[PDB]
């Protein structure tokens, strides 16, 4: 297995953004740098923002504040890719889990954006013994 | 090879297989590149290898040698001294 983490490179996305809007990378506006931070390298978001910009070069900041909003319902593009939007992709993943598992994920919702929590706390919220708890997470 | 020449070789089948002298043609068919060395051997070994069988296989294979197959064939006939046969064929193609 080769495992692709969703990251990308800040240098690369600028490369991608330039292609999307067709300008020397430096010629790119000050706004551009910040939105990529939001993107977090999900090239789907970059293409999704990028195409979205092809139509409306003027409304550049708008989407910046939009991703600052944190809602992805605003961003949509018809694309070769099979979904209107990034929110659209995640919904497809969630459904599959067996009903017993499915409830648990939501509890998983509370956890910080960037905390590696020690397994135990998950044991406590679940109230379910540790040897068992790890496997569902696996 | 166009239909006129193919049709001509068909209508003239008898006269040809009755009159063709192949013994001295071999080298001219090769020298003029009408046929390839391998096909020439195939023709000489046709059927019982009789003059007629060879002559018949020669004129059948001729259809597969391109647009200049007939006039090239006629040239080989002439340098072999088969003037009446060459004449008949020429008069026919020229009757146009």
């Amino acid at each position: 297995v080769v495992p692709v983490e969703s990251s990308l490179g800040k240098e690369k996305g600028l490369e991608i953004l330039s292609l999307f809007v067709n300008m020397k990378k430096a010629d790119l506006p000050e706004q551009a740098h910040s939105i990529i931070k939001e993107c977090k390298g999900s090239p789907l978001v970059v293409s999704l923002i990028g195409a979205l910009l092809r139509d409306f070069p003027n409304r550049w900041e708008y989407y910046l504040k939009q991703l600052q909003n944190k809602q992805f319902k605003r961003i949509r593009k018809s694309s070769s890719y099979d979904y209107e939007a990034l929110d659209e992709a995640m919904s497809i993943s969630v459904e599959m889990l067996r009903e017993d598992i499915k409830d648990y994920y939501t509890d998983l919702s509370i956890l910080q954006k960037d905390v590696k929590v020690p397994t135990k706390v998950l044991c406590i919220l679940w109230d379910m013994e540790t040897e068992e708890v790890e496997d569902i997470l696996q | 090879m166009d239909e006129a020449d193919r049709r001509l070789l068909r209508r003239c089948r008898l006269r040809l297989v009755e009159e063709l002298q192949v013994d001295q043609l071999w080298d001219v068919l090769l020298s003029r590149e009408l046929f390839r060395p391998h096909m020439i051997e195939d023709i000489q070994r046709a059927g019982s290898g009789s003059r007629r069988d060879q002559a018949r296989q020669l004129i059948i294979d001729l259809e597969t040698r391109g647009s200049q197959a007939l006039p090239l064939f006629i040239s080989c006939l002439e340098d072999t001294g088969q003037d009446m046969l060459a004449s008949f064929l020429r008069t026919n193609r020229q009757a146009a």
């Binding site: 593009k77 694309s79 070769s80 | -």
Partner: protein
Amino acid sequence: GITSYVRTVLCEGGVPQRPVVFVTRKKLVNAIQQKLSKLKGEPGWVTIHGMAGCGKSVLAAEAVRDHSLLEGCFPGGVHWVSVGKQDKSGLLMKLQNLCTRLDQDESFSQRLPLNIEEAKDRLRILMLRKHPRSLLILDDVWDSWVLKAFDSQCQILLTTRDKSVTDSVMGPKY
């Protein structure tokens, strides 16, 4: 000046002959043709659009009407398909019909696919071997899945009213 040959290729293609009462639009035809020339090889889609009744089809017919761009550029024949507006079932038939049209020899199975994708395979394969230098022209087209169906990776140019239609598709678009 139409070559006699051009008409012979065109007849096989099935494009309509231009209305007797027509008036060239040299600049426009020239632009499509020069652009049309652009995808010299490798897949590619061209979209043409206007408010209703802008000469959109006639130009498509007219552009290919000329010998120079078509003959040197397009060893493959031209095939025209009249897509119209279609429910999923209706679309299916056009595909089979294009299957029957393209396979004149009949070497390929007389049986026709009951599945859209299989028809997509027959098109791609037929375009790839039987006639790849071929260009396909479409008429109208009102929804994306339609071009999804025709998305053979072989050049197809769709002429229409919506320009949104060719968004599902992949490859260079002009």
